[PDB]
């Protein structure tokens, strides 16, 4: 695997691709 | 955090597994 | 709902997600 | 316009409804 | 057709949309 | 190359056909 720069709605896709059936939490800082 | 680190620098898929349930 | 920064092909997705069955018009300035 | 405002600043989904048919 | 600025995972989509059944090669410089 | 030119400048779909098999 390679090191990725991920920003946006593009990232959460990788959260789904990585996770999938486990589901994830998406926690930005605001 | 991840959102910030993956977006300010680079992160790996191994780091992403940490936030799966 | 939250305020979004949208740019690109990423935006037109939100046009589809917002609109859907109504359809939309996509009008950039050029 | 919307394309410019959503991309130079932020816009809301309510503003997006204006361009649905 | 119009001239596009393409960067990222967004691009490879256009590689699929352009190519499709032919398949493509994705060759970045690193 | 294409990845760099489409991402540093603009490219056209005709240029993309060159990398289909
Ligand atoms: Zn993007």
From Swiss-Prot, chains B, D, F:
It comes from the Eukaryota. Disulfide bonds join 6-11. This is Insulin A chain. It comes from Bos taurus (Bovine). The gene is INS. The chain holds residues 85 to 105 of 105 of the full protein.
